[PDB]
């Protein structure tokens with residue numbers, strides 16, 4: 001609040017304007033980065049109420065309705081595990097909207113595969129989508145269909161091991 | 171206002187139904203990327219001292 | 221990476237201190253619902269699409285490419301056989317046409 | 327297949 005200090009500071013010119021402009025550019029660059037990373041879909045997709053995905057379990061990555069934050073258990077664990085002229089500007093996207101964006105992306109990639117990323121969301125059964133991904137890496141559909149229960153069990157076990165590893169590693 | 175992330179689109183998922191496209195759109199989009207800046211040279215002695 | 225949609229091609233244009241890419245892409249449109257099955261059960265054998273997908277418009281079953289609706293008769297030329305019908309979950313019963321079948325009859 | 331059914 002010193003007037004004499006500001007009067008002496010005015011002799012140095014527009015340094016303060018340069019620093020404020022640089023910090024403003026950084027602050028808008030963070031919001032631009034968040035838009036570029038998370039806001040890649042203009043449609044808010046939702047999962048069906050019936051979780052019939054041919055044995056595949058997505059409860060650990062889908063948002064929990066019981067939680068007020070509308071986060072997944074994995075995302076809730078991630079949020080729990082992260083802990084004089086200065087001001088902190090809030091981000092343009094809040095945490096619940098970022099979680100909503102991730103939920104929309106999860107619903108799109110579960111219910112529609114990769115079709116929603118290239119245009120309108122085209123529904124497809126999830127085992128058929130997994131068979132398409134198997135054909136992408138050069139494995140025939142029959143291998144996926146015959147061992148569908150084993151693949152779903154391995155996927156659920158791997159997701160549970162991921163949750164255990166995140167909960168057990170500082 | 172509180173910003174809407176997007177229009178809601180509930181995908182009609184079921185275990186035995188698929189959606190197959192019957193038509194297509196040839197879409198042309200623009201992407202602008204900067205390549206270079208203005209090449210500026212400053213004579214340090216002439217700038218500071220003339 | 222090269223525009224929204226399935227990338228077909230791109231065209232470069234010069235700009236003052238910059239480049240403009242015109243991305244020509246393929247976007248699906250006018251989608252239609254169909255009833256789908258993972259495999260077709262015929263003569264105690266499971267049939268799987270070689271490159272396409274089994275679709276049904278309500279009464280008849282066809283095989284089509286995944287990115288465009290082009291229904292064709294389910295034959296042995298666009299399907300392959302692996303195993304019986306007891307393993308695949310959701311396999312349905314439908315006939316499979318044989319192109320060689322009218323030939324030896326005549 | 328054409329020579330096959332001929333013979």
Ligand SMILES: *[C@@H]1O[C@H](CO)[C@@H](O[C@@H]2O[C@H](CO)[C@@H](O)[C@H](O)[C@H]2NC(C)=O)[C@H](O)[C@H]1NC(C)=O
Nearest residue numbers: 051052053055056057058059060073156159160
């Ligand atoms: C998917 O996984 C979740 C958890 O991984 C399963 O929920 C469990 O269900 C059992 C039996 O109903 C309960 O004893 C557990 O307490 C539940 N755990 C949690 C975290 O809710 C769920 O049953 C699985 N299957 C489906 C179809 O959702």
Ligand SMILES: *[C@@H]1O[C@H](CO)[C@@H](O[C@@H]2O[C@H](CO)[C@@H](O)[C@H](O)[C@H]2NC(C)=O)[C@H](O)[C@H]1NC(C)=O
Nearest residue numbers: 191192193194195196197248249250251252289
């Ligand atoms: C696929 O979509 C195109 C439009 O992109 C359709 O072409 C139009 O067809 C109507 C009637 O058939 C004409 O009146 C328009 O002038 C056409 N537009 C253009 C740009 O040519 C086409 O018919 C559609 N095909 C199918 C099978 O639905």
Ligand SMILES: *[C@@H]1O[C@H](CO)[C@@H](O[C@@H]2O[C@H](CO)[C@@H](O)[C@H](O)[C@H]2NC(C)=O)[C@H](O)[C@H]1NC(C)=O
Nearest residue numbers: 179180181182183187189190250251252253254
């Ligand atoms: C495929 O079938 C689904 C299920 O009926 C259709 O989804 C419905 O569409 C109508 C018309 O827009 C809506 O009023 C309903 O609310 C939708 N239901 C659900 C559960 O989403 C869908 O439109 C059909 N697709 C096509 C291309 O006809």
Ligand SMILES: *[C@@H]1O[C@H](CO)[C@@H](O[C@@H]2O[C@H](CO)[C@@H](O)[C@H](O)[C@H]2NC(C)=O)[C@H](O)[C@H]1NC(C)=O
Nearest residue numbers: 254255275276277278279280281282291292293
């Ligand atoms: C599904 O598509 C097939 C192929 O077009 C339809 O079969 C034809 O239906 C017309 C309708 O009058 C008949 O005149 C033809 O004789 C049928 N063809 C054959 C080979 O039988 C079928 O009706 C369609 N089903 C639905 C529910 O739309």
Ligand SMILES: *[C@@H]1O[C@H](CO)[C@@H](O[C@@H]2O[C@H](CO)[C@@H](O)[C@H](O)[C@H]2NC(C)=O)[C@H](O)[C@H]1NC(C)=O
Nearest residue numbers: 260261262263264265305306310311312313314
């Ligand atoms: C598809 O066809 C098979 C046989 O070609 C059917 O299997 C029969 O089902 C009946 C009643 O469930 C049994 O009594 C027979 O013993 C079965 N035969 C064999 C060889 O498994 C099957 O039910 C048919 N599926 C549908 C949906 O009609």
Ligand SMILES: *[C@@H]1O[C@H](CO)[C@@H](O)[C@H](O)[C@H]1NC(C)=O
Nearest residue numbers: 052054184185186309310311
């Ligand atoms: C699909 O879900 C229905 C429930 O209405 C069930 O009867 C049917 O057996 C299921 N099919 C497959 C292949 O899971």
